[PDB]
């Protein structure tokens, strides 16, 4: 065995790394190697070829939220005349997980097939780390003493290893799981606590709520007062109400202090407040941290931020020329389309003679809660710190179809935040069925510096929820040098 040489070696065959590698090989004719620890989804390492989104992320969770939405569909169908034997209804979690596994594995195999097929784009199985500025070592395990499978020479090295769930250091943490294990639970839990106020905790609470066996209960806890920090506050409050209305118990200002096993093997959670809760599963979803430990970055001196991500400039360059980093390892916006964008921009800059930096502002994103969130741009309290005068246009109402369906608690919320001095739309925030689909073209609008008049001048599609975005002409309230008020002074 001799070492192999490449123009670019990518560590991590995920959302950003695969985009960069495919583009460098097929668009610019470079010789590319990509390293990942596993060729298909699941234990032991959960992520695999395709990345976190494909294997234990956006793709399987969206399939599972879609399955969970049928609990609402079956019940809501009666208002429209549908009759069937309600007593016969069962939610078969094993079938859902098996269908999901097959879909994910099909993607694994297609990525595998393209590496087999594509000239100058090679896959290597193992753990990648940095030996020197131009050599990536591939070992059998994360342990730097494990056996060497390959040495990959590289003119350019891309770090794209993603992130990993954070687990708090509490007694009994070994009795708890993360989202990785949640995707493979043999049976749906009767009682489950999801710990965290972020999108992963909220989304899984909705999944477990639909598939729980008879007499089950889903509890979400969050250590601060209101879940979903960073999202629009009206939407944060409404999502809490609508989760509660669908049977999920939301414990705010509460945080686990320890977990122990009852004699029957269930989990006994004690909170810092002294409250207790018995559940069958505790899922920790308190945050995700960049995966830097195994790369041996000390060997070449790549600088990390205080937070722990790889430090990068606007062009994804580390402090070592010829070493770059994109995606969750940079510990900024942890979204699959941002990682892909960064990968494509980096490759255009390095090999394409067309420099380009990713725009991290006005990125549209979604939460697949039930019902879901779609958002793009600034929340109003952030905008009020940066702009002298901010206007907020707001529409909130239960749609007519949900006055027939029985789900009257399902208010649709649409909000537009503007710089009132010139009308520029600073942000759009949506809650309700369809919000993730509605918000995509809003992202294009904000990239084009749309003003509130551009929205209002556009003729609505009727009847839709989206048309509310094009029917708002008068602010609901304002911020004036940071101060909220119904009217301008």
Ligand X SMILES: Cc1cc2nc3c(=O)[nH]c(=O)nc-3n(C[C@H](O)[C@H](O)[C@H](O)COP(=O)(O)OP(=O)(O)OC[C@H]3O[C@@H](n4cnc5c(N)ncnc54)[C@H](O)[C@@H]3O)c2cc1C
Ligand Y SMILES: Cc1nccn1Cc1cccc(C#N)c1
Q: Which residues bind ligand Y (CB under 6 A)?
A: 18-19, 21-22, 32, 34, 111, 114-115, 121
Which residue in 14, 374, 377, 427 binds its own copies (CB under 8 A)? 374
Of residues 173 through 212, those in contact with ligand X by CB under 6 A are: 179, 200
Contact stretch for its own copies (CB under 8 A) within 295-303, 378-386, 416-424, 459-467:
459-467
User: What is the sign of the dihedral through the CA atoms of 342, 346, 352 and 354?
Assistant: positive
Q: With CB cut-offs between 5 and 8 Å by kind, which of ligand Y, ligand X, its own copies, none does residue 292 bind?
A: none
Query: Does 229 appear as a known binding residue?
Result: yes
Q: Is 336 in the site for its own copies (CB under 8 A)?
A: yes
Does residue 41 carry a catalytic annotation?
no
Name the residue among 57, 18, 100 with its Cα closest to residue 335.
Answer: 57
> What CA–CA distance (Å, rounded) separates 155 from 159?
13
Report the alpha-carbon angle 282-285-288, nearest 5: 145
DSSP letter assigned to residue 230: T
C-beta of residue 80 within 8 angstroms of C-beta of residue 401 = no
State the DSSP string of 201-227: HHHHHHHHHHHPPTT-EEEEEESSSSS
C-beta of residue 279 within 8 angstroms of C-beta of residue 189 = yes
Query: Which residues on neighbouring strands pair with residue 122, listed in sequence order?
Result: 33
Which residue in 85, 117, 174, 486 binds its own copies (CB under 8 A)? 85
DSSP letter assigned to residue 461: P
Query: Does 199 appear as a known binding residue?
Result: yes
Q: How far is the CB of 441 from ligand Y (least distance, A)?
A: 23
Among candidate residues 73, 420, 429, 462, the one labeled active-site is 462
Query: Does 202 appear as a known binding residue?
Result: yes
Q: Is 415 in the site for ligand X (CB under 6 A)?
A: no
C-beta of residue 335 within 8 angstroms of C-beta of residue 343 = no
C-beta of residue 336 within 8 angstroms of C-beta of residue 53 = yes
Q: Is 397 in the site for its own copies (CB under 8 A)?
A: no
Q: How far is the CB of 272 from ligand X (least distance, A)?
A: 26
Query: Does 176 appear as a known binding residue?
Result: no
DSSP letter assigned to residue 303: P
Q: How far is the CB of 380 from ligand X (least distance, A)?
A: 24
Which is nearer to Br ion, 94 or 275 (by Cβ)?
94
Give residue 379's Cα distance to chain centre. Answer: 18
Long-range contacts of range 43-49, CB-CB < 8 Å, 24 or more positions apart?
Answer: 43/184, 46/180, 46/183, 47/14, 47/162, 48/13, 48/108, 49/13, 49/108, 49/111, 49/112, 49/123
Query: Does 336 appear as a known binding residue?
Result: yes
Q: Distances from the Cα of 1 to the Cαs of 10, 31, 67, 148, 155, in angstroms?
A: 21, 19, 49, 11, 21
Q: Is 208 in the site for Br ion (CB under 5 A)?
A: no
> What CA–CA distance (Å, rounded) separates 241 from 300?
51
Q: With CB cut-offs between 5 and 8 Å by kind, which of ligand Y, its own copies, Br ion, none does residue 115 bind?
A: ligand Y
Q: Is 359 in the site for its own copies (CB under 8 A)?
A: yes
H or E element that contains 345: helix 336-351
Q: Is 226 in the site for Br ion (CB under 5 A)?
A: yes
H or E element that contains 195: strand 191-195
Of residues 247 through 286, those in contact with ligand X by CB under 6 A are: none
Q: Is 42 in the site for ligand X (CB under 6 A)?
A: no
Q: How far is the CB of 22 from ligand Y (least distance, A)?
A: 3
Q: Is 41 in the site for ligand X (CB under 6 A)?
A: no
Contact stretch for ligand X (CB under 6 A) within 29-37, 241-249, 376-384, 467-475:
29-37
Query: Does 326 appear as a known binding residue?
Result: no
Q: With CB cut-offs between 5 and 8 Å by kind, which of ligand Y, its own copies, Br ion, none does residue 224 bind?
A: Br ion
Which is nearer to ligand X, 280 or 328 (by Cβ)?
328
Q: Is 403 in the site for its own copies (CB under 8 A)?
A: yes
Please give the annotated binding residues for NAD(+), written as ranges: 196-203, 287
The residues annotated as belonging to the active site are 462
Catalog residues that contact Br ion under the rule CB under 5 A. Answer: 92-94, 224-226
Catalog residues that contact ligand X under the rule CB under 6 A. Answer: 11-17, 35-37, 45, 47-48, 51-53, 57-58, 61, 127-128, 160-162, 179, 200, 291, 294-295, 327-329, 334-337, 339, 462
Please give the annotated binding residues for Mg(2+), written as ranges: 115, 118, 121-122
């Amino acid at each position: 065995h001799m070492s192999k040489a490449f123009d670019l070696v990518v560590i991590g065959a995920g959302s950003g790394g695969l985009e960069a590698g495919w583009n460098a090989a097929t668009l610019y004719g470079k010789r590319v190697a990509v390293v990942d620890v596993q060729t298909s989804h699941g234990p032991p390492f959960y992520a695999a070829l395709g990345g976190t989104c494909v294997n234990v992320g956006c793709v399987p969770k969206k399939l599972m939220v879609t399955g969970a939405q049928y609990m609402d569909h079956l019940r809501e169908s009666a208002g429209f005349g549908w009759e069937f034997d309600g007593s016969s209804v069962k939610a078969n979690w094993k079938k859902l997980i098996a269908a999901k596994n097959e879909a994910v594995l099909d993607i694994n195999k297609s990525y595998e097939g393209m590496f087999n097929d594509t000239e100058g784009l090679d896959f290597f199985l193992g753990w990648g780390s940095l030996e020197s500025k131009n050599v990536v070592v591939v070992r059998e395990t994360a342990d730097p003493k494990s056996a060497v499978k390959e040495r990959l020479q590289a003119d350019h090295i891309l770090l794209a290893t993603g992130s990993w769930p954070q687990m708090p250091a509490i007694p009994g943490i070994e009795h708890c799981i993360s989202s990785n294990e949640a995707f493979y639970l043999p049976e749906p839990p009767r009682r489950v606590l999801t710990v965290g106020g972020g999108f992963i905790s909220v989304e899984f609470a909705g999944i477990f709520n639909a598939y729980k066996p008879p007499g089950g209960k889903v509890t979400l806890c969050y250590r601060n007062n209101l879940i979903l920090r960073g999202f629009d506050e009206t939407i944060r409050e409404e999502v809490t109400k609508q989760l509660t209305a669908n049977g999920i118990e939301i414990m705010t200002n509460e945080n686990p202090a320890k977990v122990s096993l009852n004699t029957d093997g269930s989990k006994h959670v004690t909170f810092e407040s002294g409250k207790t809760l018995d559940v069958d599963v505790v899922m920790m979803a308190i945050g995700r941290i960049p995966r830097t430990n195994d790369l041996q970055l000390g060997n070449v001196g790549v600088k990390l931020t205080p937070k722990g991500g790889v430090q990068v400039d606007e062009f994804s360059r580390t402090n070592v020329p010829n070493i770059y980093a994109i995606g969750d390892i940079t510990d900024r916006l942890m979204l699959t389309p941002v990682a892909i964008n960064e990968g494509a921009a980096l490759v255009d800059t390095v090999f394409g003679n067309k420099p380009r930096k990713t725009d991290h502002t006005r990125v549209a994103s979604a939460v697949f809660s039930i019902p879901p969130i779609g958002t793009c741009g600034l929340i109003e309290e952030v905008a009020a710190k940066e702009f002298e005068k901010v206007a907020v246009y707001m529409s909130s109402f239960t749609p007519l179809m949900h006055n027939i369906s029985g789900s009257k608690y399902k208010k649709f919320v649409a909000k537009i935040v503007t710089n009132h001095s010139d009308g520029t739309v600073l942000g759009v925030h949506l809650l309700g069925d369809g919000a993730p689909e509605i918000i995509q073209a809003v992202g294009v609008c904000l990239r084009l510096n749309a003003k509130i008049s551009d929205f209002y001048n556009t003729i609505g599609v009727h009847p839709t929820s989206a048309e509310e975005l094009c029917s708002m002409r008068t602010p609901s309230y304002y911020y004036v040098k940071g101060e909220k008020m119904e009217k301008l002074p």
